[PDB]
């Protein structure tokens, strides 16, 4: 059982599901609402047993209302409690190289059709408009987003900002000014 305010909390992944935020930790996930209080914790397998027990990264696709879940080399598309047919797919149909096995985080920006997947120390920018990898990548975490470290454990965009969680730390980054607006404890996403 994950501790909501263990000031040593790191997160495994983070999406948004129809304007409801989902934070994954181990075989759990916290569900958050647009308000101020409350933060439920369910088992992941309560909702989707076909999934793995650990989640590597997660992102929501706004035009399809889908959530892609990454674990090792396989990824799952999910809509509701369902799992789209044809899944789990490999991360190969994704165009990622093969010296790449894990995906640590993922964010999709509705502004550009660009899906930002991070692996180990690099990034990769897919084009979820044309299904293509923006060729000027794999850039280094350090090169593109300087300041946040050299690894991303979870990431999400709540309007304007891209939130990077590096270990027990949260960065409120500005995609437009390329500068860390503010730094916080990872668990404040859960009000702690």
Give me the DSSP letters along 117-143: EEETTEEEEEETTTTEE-SS---BHHH
Q: Which residues pair with 77 in a beta bridge?
A: 68
Applying CB under 5 A, among 91, 105, 148, 186 the residue interacting with Cl ion is 105
| Partner touching 104 among Ca ion, Cl ion, none, CB below 5 to 8 Å by kind | Ca ion
Q: What is the largest CA-CA distance in the chain?
A: 43
- SS3 label, residue 64: coil
Q: Which DSSP category does 87 fall into?
A: P
Separation CA 158–CA 172 (nearest Å): 10
Integer Cα distance of 163 and 96 in angstroms: 23
Least Å distance, CB 154 to Ca ion, is 5
For Cl ion, which residue of 57, 148, 186, 190 counts as binding (CB under 5 A)? 57
**Is residue 166 part of the contact set for Ca ion (CB under 5 A)?**
no
Structure tokens at 116: 């930002």
Of residues 118 and 138, the one with the C-beta less far from Cl ion: 118
- With CB under 5 A as the contact rule, the residue among 59, 68, 75, 118 that binds Cl ion is 59
User: In which element (H, E) is residue 142 found?
Assistant: helix 141-144
Binding mask 89-128 for Ca ion (x = CB under 5 A): ---------------x-xx---------------------
- Nearer to Ca ion by Cβ, of 57 and 85: the residue is 57
| Binding piece for Cl ion, criterion CB under 5 A, among 111-119, 125-133, 148-156, 164-172 | 148-156
Which parts of this chain interact with Cl ion (CB under 5 A)?
13-15, 57-59, 105-107, 154-156
């Amino acid at each position: 059982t994950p501790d909501k305010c263990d000031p040593s909390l790191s997160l495994d992944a983070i999406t948004s599901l129809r304007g409801e935020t989902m934070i994954f930790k181990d075989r759990f996930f916290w569900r958050l609402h647009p308000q101020q209080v409350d933060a439920e914790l369910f088992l992941t397998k309560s909702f989707w047993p076909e999934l793995p027990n650990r989640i590597d990264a997660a992102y929501e696709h706004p035009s399809h209302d889908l959530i892609f879940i990454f674990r090792g080399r396989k990824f799952w598309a999910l809509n509701g409690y369902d799992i789209l047919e044809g899944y789990p797919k490999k991360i190969s149909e994704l165009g990622l190289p093969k010296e790449v096995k894990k995906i640590s985080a993922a964010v999709h920006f509705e502004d550009t059709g660009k899906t930002l997947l991070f692996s180990g120390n690099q990034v990769w920018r897919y084009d979820d408009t044309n299904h293509i990898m923006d060729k000027d990548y794999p850039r280094l975490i350090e090169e593109d987003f300087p300041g946040i470290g050299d690894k991303v454990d979870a990431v999400y965009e709540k309007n304007g900002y891209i939130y990077f969680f590096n270990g027990p730390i949260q960065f409120e980054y500005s995609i437009w000014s390329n500068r860390i607006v503010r730094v916080m404890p990872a668990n404040s996403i859960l009000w702690c």
